[PDB]
Design a protein around this ligand. Sequence first.
Ligand code: NA
Ligand code: NA
Lengths: 101, 86
Amino acid sequence: HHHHSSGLVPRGSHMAGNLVIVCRDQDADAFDQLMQEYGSFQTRLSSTAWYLNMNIVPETLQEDILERVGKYTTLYIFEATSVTYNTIDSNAAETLSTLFG
Amino acid sequence: AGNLVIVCRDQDADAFDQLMQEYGSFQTRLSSTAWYLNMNIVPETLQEDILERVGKYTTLYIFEATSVTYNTIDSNAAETLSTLFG
Ligand code: NA
Ligand code: NA
């Protein structure tokens, strides 16, 4: 079973807010430093994209990030309602089912 | 339509971007490894399509999005999101 999907459901330890944060390549390392502050509630999907399970209004996260990295920084924050994904890595798959619900 | 965010690993960036071209003005590239797509497509169908063309061991994530907030230097992304997202 390498194909998976989740409706990112709030119930139990899965918070209601499901966010996808994307930056530009040039800011990858700075966004990662910042995302690590959210602990086990985020995971890095690529050098420039993260998933965050947290009850935070997107515009508020945006103001927070711009205050730290600078107001001329490019970023995109989406509220997600589902995820469909594929991985070949057994270790990444268990992290992800847990993080996604 | 539906609002999708597609993310791959850095190793696959060139292959994904070639493939995302078929969606024309309905997609915009946000970074090397992330795209926004405005299209009426089932996410598992998009996923099966991608895996058939890039390889079945490829890592990918497809999110259905219900809102976006952004600040950007990329004129194509600003225009595509502000016009198509809703
Ligand atoms: Na939220
Ligand atoms: Na096809």
